[PDB]
Amino acid sequence: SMQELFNNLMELCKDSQRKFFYSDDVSASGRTYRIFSYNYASYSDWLLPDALECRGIMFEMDGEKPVRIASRPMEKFFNLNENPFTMNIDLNDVDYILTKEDGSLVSTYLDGDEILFKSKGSIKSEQALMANGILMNINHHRLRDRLKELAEDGFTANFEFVAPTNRIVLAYQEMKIILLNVRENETGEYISYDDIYKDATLRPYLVERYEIDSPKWIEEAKNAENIEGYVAVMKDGSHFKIKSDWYVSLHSTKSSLDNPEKLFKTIIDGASDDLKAMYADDEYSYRKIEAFETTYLKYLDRALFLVLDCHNKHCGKDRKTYAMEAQGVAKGAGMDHLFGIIMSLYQGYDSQEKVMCEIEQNFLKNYKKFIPEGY
Ligand SMILES: Nc1ncnc2c1ncn2[C@@H]1O[C@H](COP(=O)(O)CP(=O)(O)OP(=O)(O)O)[C@@H](O)[C@H]1O
Ligand SMILES: [Ca+2]
Ligand SMILES: [Cl-]
Ligand SMILES: [Cl-]
Ligand SMILES: [Mg+2]
């Protein structure tokens, strides 16, 4: 049930903000929403109860009790051969593929009498607000009506928001929203592509589908240029993706496999999953990347706890006493480089998020000492 899904999601957020977390938002109409997201997660984490649904699902809240699922974005999915979820896949079970658009996901939710958009982790991000602005345009009033009724019926429409001012890798000329899929809030089931295709009002915004009879599209995707790739939809409705080496080589940034600082940066940027899949045929590289991932997740858990714990437990005391406790915790953990971050938490950080960004940047300066043994 909806309450059971909510309980499992709250259970995932107990660990640390490094993994699964939630955040409360208030819309212009004053309604209270709780979004469940994530930062870094290993295969083992994705195996936890309903963890795959912890990437953007939103509930309208009444205190700590959920009233309804306001928005249901897609479940987390991965690149082919990225981890056990997408290994040993029967490629002949691929139903069809879709153009993988390169922007930012925006998902609908009904707010009072208004149909609005939310980005991955916020209802007021820059993409979310710009997306809302588009839906207000008279040239999209028929779509707006369509989306509003869907939402009042318990369905979430997921779009890729693209724009020249929202460039990731691909260069889009105009700002627009491309319809990717429509998911039922309560069950998580998707309306078939065909059913969406049937609606002449929606078709113009619908992402392009390519029918499939063989897996030849895969190697062609990997070797293509000027495209990110495609999202495959299986006979059972599940997804997996194929990104071109060209796209990943630009998204990764530089020479990750030849420079530990750059590899760690890729991991921090959340792009090592693509890199890992790209080198799936290169066992050494694939596993090397995993080792750095594991090393980074382990460090982040430890560092985050250490800094937050020390601040919480000694924030009240004076500066000298605090500094001594900070020195103690830092020194007593081979984490001497964290003293500065701890000293900065005394006057607090704009969020357990700000703290995490300083830790990430600070890690890139002291990366040398954490390179996994053997590399
Ligand atoms: N046709 C399509 N179907 C589904 N998703 C699509 C799509 N084309 C574009 N996408 C985008 O693909 C995104 C997920 O794949 P990625 O781009 O690799 C981000 P991720 O790494 O999986 O999650 P993360 O960035 O929070 O770590 C979706 O959020 C969606 O916005
Ligand atoms: Ca993307
Ligand atoms: Cl709003
Ligand atoms: Cl996204
Ligand atoms: Mg990623």
Short mmCIF file of C-alpha atoms and ligand atoms in Angstrom, two decimals:
data_model
loop_
_atom_site.label_atom_id
_atom_site.label_comp_id
_atom_site.label_asym_id
_atom_site.label_seq_id
_atom_site.Cartn_x
_atom_site.Cartn_y
_atom_site.Cartn_z
CA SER A 1 0.00 0.00 0.00
CA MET A 2 0.88 3.70 -0.13
CA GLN A 3 1.61 3.76 3.60
CA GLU A 4 3.86 0.70 3.29
CA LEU A 5 5.84 2.31 0.46
CA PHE A 6 6.23 5.45 2.55
CA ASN A 7 7.41 3.48 5.59
CA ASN A 8 10.04 1.62 3.56
CA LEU A 9 11.28 4.90 2.09
CA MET A 10 11.58 6.53 5.51
CA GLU A 11 13.47 3.42 6.62
CA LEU A 12 16.08 4.02 3.89
CA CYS A 13 16.70 7.58 5.06
CA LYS A 14 17.82 6.47 8.52
CA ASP A 15 21.37 5.60 7.41
CA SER A 16 22.89 8.88 6.11
CA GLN A 17 22.35 11.79 3.73
CA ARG A 18 25.12 10.22 1.66
CA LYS A 19 22.68 7.53 0.55
CA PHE A 20 18.89 7.96 0.66
CA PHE A 21 17.35 11.12 2.07
CA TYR A 22 14.21 13.22 1.96
CA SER A 23 13.43 16.91 1.98
CA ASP A 24 10.30 18.90 2.77
CA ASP A 25 9.03 21.62 0.42
CA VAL A 26 6.11 24.04 0.51
CA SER A 27 4.42 25.10 -2.73
CA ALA A 28 3.11 28.58 -3.57
CA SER A 29 -0.37 27.39 -2.61
CA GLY A 30 1.04 26.38 0.76
CA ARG A 31 0.74 22.62 0.40
CA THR A 32 3.44 20.53 2.13
CA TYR A 33 5.35 17.93 0.12
CA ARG A 34 8.08 15.45 0.99
CA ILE A 35 10.47 14.30 -1.73
CA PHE A 36 12.57 11.15 -1.42
CA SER A 37 15.90 11.21 -3.25
CA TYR A 38 19.46 9.90 -3.07
CA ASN A 39 23.06 11.02 -3.62
CA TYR A 40 25.31 7.96 -3.76
CA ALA A 41 24.16 4.35 -3.70
CA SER A 42 25.92 1.04 -4.28
CA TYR A 43 24.35 -2.06 -5.81
CA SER A 44 23.80 -3.36 -2.28
CA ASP A 45 21.95 -0.17 -1.36
CA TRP A 46 19.71 -0.42 -4.43
CA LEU A 47 18.73 -3.87 -3.16
CA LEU A 48 17.09 -2.48 -0.01
CA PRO A 49 13.25 -2.46 0.18
CA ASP A 50 11.80 -0.03 -2.38
CA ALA A 51 15.20 1.61 -2.79
CA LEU A 52 14.69 1.73 -6.57
CA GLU A 53 11.69 3.99 -5.99
CA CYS A 54 13.74 6.45 -3.97
CA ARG A 55 14.67 8.83 -6.79
CA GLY A 56 12.13 11.63 -6.85
CA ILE A 57 8.88 10.09 -5.58
CA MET A 58 6.85 12.80 -3.81
CA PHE A 59 4.04 12.57 -1.22
CA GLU A 60 1.80 15.40 -0.09
CA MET A 61 2.29 15.48 3.67
CA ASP A 62 0.16 16.27 6.72
CA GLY A 63 2.84 16.52 9.36
CA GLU A 64 4.56 13.14 9.36
CA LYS A 65 1.65 11.23 7.86
CA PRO A 66 1.48 10.94 4.06
CA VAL A 67 -1.84 11.88 2.48
CA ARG A 68 -1.13 10.80 -1.11
CA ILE A 69 1.57 10.16 -3.68
CA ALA A 70 1.70 13.52 -5.49
CA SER A 71 4.29 12.60 -8.13
CA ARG A 72 5.75 9.31 -9.33
CA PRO A 73 8.87 9.60 -11.49
CA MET A 74 10.46 6.51 -13.05
CA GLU A 75 12.19 3.95 -10.86
CA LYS A 76 15.99 4.18 -10.83
CA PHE A 77 17.40 2.30 -13.83
CA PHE A 78 20.90 1.64 -15.12
CA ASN A 79 23.22 1.29 -18.10
CA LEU A 80 23.54 -2.21 -19.55
CA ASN A 81 26.32 -4.16 -17.78
CA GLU A 82 26.64 -1.48 -15.08
CA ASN A 83 25.86 -3.85 -12.19
CA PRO A 84 24.07 -7.20 -11.55
CA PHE A 85 20.68 -5.61 -12.35
CA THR A 86 21.71 -5.26 -15.98
CA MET A 87 24.07 -8.17 -16.53
CA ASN A 88 22.99 -11.42 -18.22
CA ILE A 89 20.05 -9.59 -19.83
CA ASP A 90 18.39 -11.41 -22.73
CA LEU A 91 18.70 -8.71 -25.39
CA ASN A 92 16.05 -10.39 -27.53
CA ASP A 93 13.58 -9.43 -24.79
CA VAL A 94 14.03 -5.77 -25.68
CA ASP A 95 10.61 -4.54 -26.82
CA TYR A 96 11.70 -1.23 -28.37
CA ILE A 97 14.05 1.68 -27.66
CA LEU A 98 13.54 5.39 -27.13
CA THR A 99 15.77 8.35 -27.92
CA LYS A 100 17.51 9.23 -24.67
CA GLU A 101 17.04 13.00 -24.45
CA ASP A 102 19.77 14.95 -22.62
CA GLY A 103 18.37 17.44 -20.12
CA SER A 104 16.67 17.32 -16.72
CA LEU A 105 13.71 15.21 -15.66
CA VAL A 106 10.52 17.08 -14.73
CA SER A 107 7.47 15.29 -13.33
CA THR A 108 3.89 16.46 -12.92
CA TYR A 109 1.91 16.81 -9.70
CA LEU A 110 -1.48 18.38 -8.99
CA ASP A 111 -1.26 21.34 -6.60
CA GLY A 112 -4.79 22.44 -5.72
CA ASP A 113 -6.30 23.34 -9.09
CA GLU A 114 -2.89 23.75 -10.73
CA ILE A 115 -0.87 21.19 -12.68
CA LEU A 116 2.83 21.76 -11.93
CA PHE A 117 6.28 20.21 -12.45
CA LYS A 118 9.00 19.03 -10.09
CA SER A 119 12.60 18.26 -10.93
CA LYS A 120 14.41 15.27 -9.41
CA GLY A 121 14.70 16.75 -5.93
CA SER A 122 12.66 19.96 -5.80
CA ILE A 123 9.39 21.64 -6.81
CA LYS A 124 11.12 25.00 -7.12
CA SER A 125 14.38 24.24 -8.90
CA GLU A 126 15.22 26.37 -11.93
CA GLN A 127 14.12 23.63 -14.34
CA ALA A 128 10.87 23.06 -12.44
CA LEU A 129 9.85 26.73 -12.58
CA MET A 130 10.83 27.12 -16.22
CA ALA A 131 8.87 23.94 -16.97
CA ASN A 132 5.83 25.42 -15.24
CA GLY A 133 6.24 28.56 -17.33
CA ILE A 134 6.05 26.57 -20.55
CA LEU A 135 2.86 24.78 -19.53
CA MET A 136 1.29 28.20 -18.96
CA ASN A 137 2.00 29.26 -22.56
CA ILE A 138 -1.22 29.36 -24.64
CA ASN A 139 0.52 27.25 -27.26
CA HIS A 140 0.52 24.39 -24.77
CA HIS A 141 -2.97 24.76 -23.27
CA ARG A 142 -4.22 21.52 -24.80
CA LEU A 143 -1.31 19.60 -23.28
CA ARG A 144 -1.81 21.37 -19.94
CA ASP A 145 -5.43 20.17 -19.89
CA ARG A 146 -4.32 16.63 -20.73
CA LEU A 147 -1.74 16.61 -17.93
CA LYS A 148 -4.11 18.12 -15.38
CA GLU A 149 -6.74 15.45 -15.96
CA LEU A 150 -4.10 12.70 -15.84
CA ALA A 151 -2.89 14.01 -12.48
CA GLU A 152 -6.40 14.22 -11.08
CA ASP A 153 -6.67 10.57 -12.16
CA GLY A 154 -3.51 9.61 -10.27
CA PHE A 155 -0.97 9.61 -13.11
CA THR A 156 2.40 11.34 -13.38
CA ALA A 157 3.71 12.52 -16.74
CA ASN A 158 7.50 12.45 -16.99
CA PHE A 159 9.28 14.80 -19.37
CA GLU A 160 12.87 15.65 -20.27
CA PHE A 161 13.34 19.40 -19.90
CA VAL A 162 15.85 20.60 -22.48
CA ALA A 163 17.21 24.07 -23.24
CA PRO A 164 20.33 25.86 -24.55
CA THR A 165 20.71 27.24 -21.01
CA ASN A 166 20.42 23.75 -19.50
CA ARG A 167 23.15 22.05 -21.52
CA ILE A 168 24.65 18.80 -20.24
CA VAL A 169 26.30 17.47 -23.38
CA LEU A 170 23.86 17.69 -26.29
CA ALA A 171 23.15 21.15 -27.68
CA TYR A 172 19.42 21.83 -27.83
CA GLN A 173 18.36 24.93 -29.76
CA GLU A 174 15.13 25.71 -27.94
CA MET A 175 13.74 25.27 -24.46
CA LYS A 176 11.04 22.62 -24.36
CA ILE A 177 9.69 19.56 -22.56
CA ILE A 178 9.72 16.13 -24.22
CA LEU A 179 7.23 13.52 -22.98
CA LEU A 180 9.03 10.35 -21.91
CA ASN A 181 6.37 8.30 -20.13
CA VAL A 182 3.28 8.36 -17.93
CA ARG A 183 3.26 6.38 -14.69
CA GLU A 184 0.37 5.51 -12.38
CA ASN A 185 1.05 7.03 -8.96
CA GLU A 186 -0.49 4.27 -6.83
CA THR A 187 0.89 1.21 -8.62
CA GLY A 188 3.93 2.46 -10.49
CA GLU A 189 2.63 0.89 -13.68
CA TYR A 190 3.25 2.72 -16.96
CA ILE A 191 0.67 3.60 -19.61
CA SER A 192 1.88 1.87 -22.79
CA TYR A 193 3.76 3.92 -25.34
CA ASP A 194 1.05 2.99 -27.86
CA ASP A 195 -1.70 4.43 -25.66
CA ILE A 196 0.22 7.71 -25.37
CA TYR A 197 0.98 7.64 -29.11
CA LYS A 198 -2.74 7.31 -29.81
CA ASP A 199 -3.43 10.75 -28.28
CA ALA A 200 -2.87 13.28 -31.11
CA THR A 201 -2.56 16.04 -28.50
CA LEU A 202 0.38 14.31 -26.77
CA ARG A 203 2.08 12.79 -29.82
CA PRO A 204 3.83 16.08 -30.79
CA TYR A 205 5.71 16.13 -27.46
CA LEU A 206 6.32 12.38 -27.36
CA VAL A 207 9.89 11.12 -27.38
CA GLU A 208 10.75 9.10 -30.47
CA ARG A 209 10.51 5.31 -30.55
CA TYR A 210 12.50 2.94 -32.76
CA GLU A 211 11.10 -0.57 -33.20
CA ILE A 212 13.45 -3.50 -32.60
CA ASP A 213 13.96 -7.01 -34.02
CA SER A 214 17.69 -7.38 -33.28
CA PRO A 215 20.36 -6.05 -30.88
CA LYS A 216 22.35 -4.29 -33.63
CA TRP A 217 21.26 -0.89 -32.31
CA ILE A 218 23.50 -1.40 -29.28
CA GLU A 219 26.95 -1.40 -30.91
CA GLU A 220 25.72 1.33 -33.25
CA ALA A 221 24.68 3.41 -30.23
CA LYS A 222 28.04 2.88 -28.53
CA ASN A 223 29.90 4.05 -31.65
CA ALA A 224 27.60 6.96 -32.52
CA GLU A 225 28.33 10.66 -32.14
CA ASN A 226 26.15 13.69 -31.34
CA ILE A 227 23.60 11.62 -29.40
CA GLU A 228 23.52 10.45 -25.80
CA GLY A 229 21.97 7.12 -26.69
CA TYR A 230 18.75 5.27 -25.99
CA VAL A 231 16.53 3.88 -23.26
CA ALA A 232 15.40 0.32 -23.88
CA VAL A 233 12.00 -0.82 -22.66
CA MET A 234 11.78 -4.57 -21.99
CA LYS A 235 8.81 -6.87 -22.56
CA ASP A 236 8.16 -6.67 -18.81
CA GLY A 237 8.25 -2.88 -18.80
CA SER A 238 11.68 -2.55 -17.16
CA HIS A 239 14.40 -0.23 -18.49
CA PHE A 240 18.13 -0.11 -19.16
CA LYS A 241 20.21 2.36 -21.13
CA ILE A 242 22.96 2.51 -23.73
CA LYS A 243 25.02 5.69 -23.96
CA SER A 244 27.55 6.38 -26.72
CA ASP A 245 31.24 6.33 -25.83
CA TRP A 246 31.25 9.78 -27.40
CA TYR A 247 28.72 11.09 -24.88
CA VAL A 248 30.34 9.41 -21.87
CA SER A 249 33.80 10.66 -22.90
CA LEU A 250 32.44 14.23 -22.77
CA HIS A 251 30.23 13.74 -19.71
CA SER A 252 32.98 12.00 -17.73
CA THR A 253 35.15 15.06 -18.48
CA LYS A 254 38.69 13.85 -19.22
CA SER A 255 41.02 10.88 -18.66
CA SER A 256 39.38 9.24 -15.65
CA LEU A 257 41.00 5.82 -16.05
CA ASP A 258 44.48 7.34 -16.16
CA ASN A 259 44.26 9.90 -13.36
CA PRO A 260 42.89 9.05 -9.87
CA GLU A 261 41.92 12.67 -9.22
CA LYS A 262 39.79 12.70 -12.37
CA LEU A 263 38.33 9.26 -11.65
CA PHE A 264 37.32 10.42 -8.16
CA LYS A 265 35.85 13.59 -9.67
CA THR A 266 33.74 11.49 -12.07
CA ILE A 267 32.49 9.44 -9.12
CA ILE A 268 31.68 12.59 -7.17
CA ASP A 269 29.83 14.03 -10.17
CA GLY A 270 27.77 10.82 -10.21
CA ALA A 271 28.98 9.83 -13.67
CA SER A 272 31.11 6.79 -12.81
CA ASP A 273 28.12 4.52 -13.52
CA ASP A 274 28.26 5.52 -17.21
CA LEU A 275 32.05 5.17 -17.24
CA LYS A 276 31.83 1.75 -15.62
CA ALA A 277 29.34 0.53 -18.24
CA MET A 278 31.52 2.03 -20.99
CA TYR A 279 34.38 -0.19 -19.84
CA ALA A 280 32.26 -3.27 -19.11
CA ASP A 281 34.31 -5.28 -21.61
CA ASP A 282 37.54 -4.16 -19.90
CA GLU A 283 37.40 -6.18 -16.66
CA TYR A 284 40.44 -4.49 -15.17
CA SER A 285 39.10 -0.99 -15.70
CA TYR A 286 35.54 -1.90 -14.73
CA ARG A 287 36.66 -3.31 -11.38
CA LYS A 288 39.22 -0.54 -10.83
CA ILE A 289 36.42 2.00 -11.12
CA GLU A 290 34.32 0.03 -8.61
CA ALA A 291 37.19 0.00 -6.14
CA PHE A 292 37.40 3.80 -6.26
CA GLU A 293 33.61 4.01 -5.91
CA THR A 294 33.67 1.77 -2.83
CA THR A 295 36.57 3.77 -1.39
CA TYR A 296 34.65 7.01 -1.91
CA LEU A 297 31.36 5.81 -0.41
CA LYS A 298 33.19 4.42 2.61
CA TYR A 299 35.09 7.67 3.12
CA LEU A 300 31.97 9.83 2.75
CA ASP A 301 29.99 7.82 5.32
CA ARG A 302 32.82 8.03 7.82
CA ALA A 303 33.69 11.69 7.15
CA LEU A 304 30.06 12.87 7.17
CA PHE A 305 29.31 11.09 10.45
CA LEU A 306 32.53 12.29 12.10
CA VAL A 307 31.98 15.95 11.21
CA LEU A 308 28.24 16.01 12.01
CA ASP A 309 28.60 13.98 15.20
CA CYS A 310 31.39 16.18 16.54
CA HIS A 311 29.50 19.39 15.71
CA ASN A 312 26.23 18.21 17.22
CA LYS A 313 27.81 16.95 20.44
CA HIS A 314 30.06 19.97 21.01
CA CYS A 315 28.39 22.89 19.21
CA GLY A 316 27.22 24.44 22.48
CA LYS A 317 30.63 24.61 24.15
CA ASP A 318 33.02 27.54 23.62
CA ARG A 319 35.42 27.78 20.70
CA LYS A 320 38.56 26.48 22.42
CA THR A 321 36.83 23.45 23.96
CA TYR A 322 35.12 22.78 20.64
CA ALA A 323 38.43 23.06 18.77
CA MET A 324 39.97 20.55 21.17
CA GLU A 325 37.09 18.11 20.58
CA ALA A 326 37.45 18.74 16.84
CA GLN A 327 41.17 18.01 17.02
CA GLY A 328 40.45 14.89 19.05
CA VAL A 329 37.87 13.46 16.66
CA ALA A 330 39.92 14.39 13.57
CA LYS A 331 43.26 13.13 14.87
CA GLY A 332 41.73 10.04 16.44
CA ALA A 333 40.63 8.74 13.04
CA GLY A 334 43.40 9.43 10.55
CA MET A 335 41.09 12.21 9.41
CA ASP A 336 43.26 15.18 10.35
CA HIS A 337 42.29 16.96 7.12
CA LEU A 338 38.74 17.26 8.45
CA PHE A 339 39.64 19.65 11.26
CA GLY A 340 38.95 22.64 9.05
CA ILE A 341 35.50 21.43 8.03
CA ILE A 342 34.63 20.72 11.66
CA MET A 343 35.82 24.19 12.72
CA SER A 344 33.49 25.62 10.05
CA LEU A 345 30.43 23.72 11.33
CA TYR A 346 30.59 25.68 14.58
CA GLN A 347 28.86 28.60 12.89
CA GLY A 348 26.81 26.06 10.97
CA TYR A 349 26.37 25.30 7.29
CA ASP A 350 23.41 26.29 5.11
CA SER A 351 22.48 22.58 5.09
CA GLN A 352 23.72 19.02 5.69
CA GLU A 353 24.14 19.47 1.97
CA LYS A 354 26.62 22.34 2.11
CA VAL A 355 28.71 20.31 4.59
CA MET A 356 28.72 17.44 2.11
CA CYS A 357 29.94 19.61 -0.75
CA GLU A 358 32.86 20.95 1.32
CA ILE A 359 33.75 17.38 2.23
CA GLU A 360 33.69 16.39 -1.44
CA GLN A 361 35.87 19.31 -2.52
CA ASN A 362 38.17 18.78 0.46
CA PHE A 363 38.46 15.12 -0.50
CA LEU A 364 39.70 15.99 -3.99
CA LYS A 365 42.60 17.91 -2.44
CA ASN A 366 43.55 15.02 -0.13
CA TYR A 367 42.70 12.23 -2.59
CA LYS A 368 46.25 10.84 -2.81
CA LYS A 369 46.03 9.14 0.59
CA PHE A 370 42.79 7.34 -0.22
CA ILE A 371 43.63 5.70 -3.55
CA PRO A 372 42.57 2.04 -2.99
CA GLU A 373 45.45 -0.34 -2.20
CA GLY A 374 46.78 -2.01 -5.32
CA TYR A 375 46.23 0.93 -7.67
N1 LIG B 1 13.40 8.21 -23.25
C1 LIG B 1 13.71 8.31 -21.91
N2 LIG B 1 13.10 7.52 -21.00
C2 LIG B 1 13.40 7.58 -19.69
N3 LIG B 1 14.37 8.39 -19.24
C3 LIG B 1 14.97 9.28 -20.06
C4 LIG B 1 14.69 9.25 -21.46
N4 LIG B 1 15.46 10.19 -22.04
C5 LIG B 1 15.97 10.95 -21.11
N5 LIG B 1 15.85 10.34 -19.89
C6 LIG B 1 16.53 10.77 -18.65
O1 LIG B 1 17.42 9.74 -18.15
C7 LIG B 1 17.51 10.00 -16.73
C8 LIG B 1 18.15 8.85 -15.94
O2 LIG B 1 19.31 8.35 -16.61
P1 LIG B 1 20.63 9.29 -16.32
O3 LIG B 1 20.65 10.39 -17.33
O4 LIG B 1 21.91 8.36 -16.56
C9 LIG B 1 20.65 10.01 -14.62
P2 LIG B 1 21.06 8.77 -13.32
O5 LIG B 1 22.54 8.60 -13.25
O6 LIG B 1 20.39 7.36 -13.71
O7 LIG B 1 20.44 9.24 -11.88
P3 LIG B 1 21.33 10.38 -11.13
O8 LIG B 1 21.82 11.40 -12.07
O9 LIG B 1 20.40 11.09 -10.04
O10 LIG B 1 22.58 9.69 -10.40
C10 LIG B 1 16.06 10.27 -16.30
O11 LIG B 1 15.99 11.01 -15.07
C11 LIG B 1 15.49 11.04 -17.52
O12 LIG B 1 15.35 12.43 -17.22
CA CA B 2 20.79 12.82 -17.80
CL CL B 3 5.18 26.16 -6.80
CL CL B 4 17.32 13.80 -14.62
MG MG B 5 24.72 8.78 -13.02
#
